[PDB]
Symmetry: D2
């Protein structure tokens, strides 16, 4: 009985921590697990394509994926692994700095049995935050960085 | 402070019941409320475009939208109303009978402060259900109907 | 394979609505369902003791209980029913007007596979509300009434003098 | 503006991890934070304390207070309530139930006091379905016996009564 669980949210909301919490619950009950992280985030098997780790993922019962927005094959990999009987758990940004869908990540939602959106704390007014605000001028989607480059931000502070 | 809350799930998961629970909480505390439903699901204003009813939503503090997937202008309405300081609560199918995004509904996710995906009971094996299965052979996306035309199903029963 | 689910929260948080949402999910999939309500609240079987109703409950697959705080035998009934393979869903206040456990209701928590606490809207400042504030001066726990006798309130409004 | 959040669940449900996830969201937004642990639980797997009163002074100088294994502090209710009323956010990870599936100390008295309450889930160590309970493996009868998976299984209803 395979499965896809999706953990959405803005930056700084602890998506990776929730991912690991959920993975460790299985691990402690004797499940073989594998966590996959996006190689190019220079801030678990590193990968740039989920194809490149599919063989390793096949000999495991539970698959965790961090920063799933950055894998071009995220959708098809997850659906294929769940149909093969695996429990697939994905941590991912739902939105870019422009509050648009981050790549193909939202295509997982109609395929998933569980979907949640976490909240961060707004770094500018300290209320609840749902969005990621880019601090710089760069216009491309993929720009790797932490709190030096992005603020987790509420609606009002986003447009401030 | 305006916001968008999204209630996703398959058919028969009680999305519009959760919509009404959330709205009545504000109503009981003396908030002015408006609920919108899709005018063509026959089976509290009906509408085909949210544009047709937006001026009315302006005179209100809390807006509920049922079957949001059927509204082509769902994204711009919810985003504009939330930025005008309204609480917008949307019940909607995340996926079609083919487990694909239903209209533009998922473009709401990166704009939303709250997103949940509800769960139904699988009408075939009686485990937890995440999807909607069309029973007949019609090909088009919009086919109105209940349990005579659709089953809420788990992954395994979907692929039978 | 039985179960207890507990829906907690203050007044006006829609606990009964969420109870019915969960029950109708099973009903629509052709489960036999029964809902039990507290009889001394006249603001779908009425009852004062769950014992009085246990045989009707034994004949269904899913049992809903509204205002579970008022039932002296809430703990033993839910446990007996869940062990007999029933799905038991309980709507109940967690706290009295004094923010104290309401009867034996919290004893369900260690017995339950699912527990949630819902939120209301504060009727005094309109932020999120977790508590039920009594408007009058009656001192007894059980006083039946709606928004004329109680406000859902946040922490600050609860303590406002 | 003060708050009490409660994270319940059986053992192995990752309550401490969820506690740290919530606290770190505040810390990363430059809030002053304090995490308190039960001193007598020395397991491999944060100020140690046996009474929350003993760390009250440190807690007063902080905006966010995390409390791990809240069930073991006798003064859990009055500490959490006083700190929330003083405008602190207090987040508590705790067992709701003992090995007997009874209330664990005073922990449930927090529930009517709390604006947020959740019960987490574990995996059943005996049938691998969802687990809501903690089953003691040995014969000890006293409530407090410190241990991990060597002494307890997270367990579903059916496996509890086997
Ligand atoms: C918002 C945004 C982030 N990013 C990048 C910046 C970071 O390197 C990376 C962060 O992605 P996250 O998915 O937020 O990293 P994470 O898994 O550690 O999340 P969490 O802290 O909640 O546990 O994404 C973009 O490239 N483009 C964007 O538009
Ligand atoms: C899955 C699917 C449903 N539908 C239709 C069939 C129904 O008339 C309608 C159901 O939409 P819902 O949004 O599920 O109706 P609802 O608001 O009453 O939700 P709930 O019962 O959980 O409270 O959508 C399609 O037209 N195409 C599809 O692919
Ligand atoms: C707080 C409190 C309420 N009550 C009573 C007043 C009401 O008659 C009754 C309401 O209990 P509820 O459990 O809130 O009734 P409900 O099922 O309608 O809940 P909801 O609206 O969320 O769906 O409880 C007391 O008797 N004593 C108290 O201390
Ligand atoms: C059930 C039970 C546990 N204990 C003890 C055993 C542990 O030392 C402690 C439980 O602490 P926990 O933090 O609840 O144990 P855990 O690490 O498995 O939890 P989590 O994964 O959610 O973070 O309490 C008792 O003393 N008596 C009991 O009846
Ligand atoms: Mg722990
Ligand atoms: Zn802000
Ligand atoms: Zn099924
Ligand atoms: Zn208030
Ligand atoms: Zn089991």
């Amino acid at each position: 009985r395979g499965q896809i669980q999706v953990i959405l949210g803005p930056m700084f909301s602890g998506k990776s921590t929730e991912l690991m919490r959920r993975v460790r619950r299985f691990q402690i009950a004797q499940y073989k697990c594998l966590v996959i992280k996006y190689a190019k985030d220079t801030r678990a098997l590193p990968a740039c394509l989920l194809r490149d780790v599919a063989q390793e993922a096949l000999g495991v019962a539970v698959i965790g994926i961090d920063e799933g927005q950055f894998f071009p094959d995220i959708v098809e990999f997850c659906e294929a692994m769940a149909n093969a009987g695996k429990t697939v758990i994905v941590a991912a940004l739902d939105g870019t700095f422009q509050r648009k869908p981050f790549g193909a990540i939202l295509n997982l939602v109609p395929l998933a049995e569980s979907v949640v959106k976490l909240t961060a704390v707004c770094m500018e007014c300290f209320r609840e935050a749902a969005y990621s605000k880019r601090l710089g001028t760069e216009k491309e989607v993929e720009v790797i960085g932490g709190a030096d480059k992005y603020h987790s931000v509420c609606r009002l502070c986003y447009f401030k």
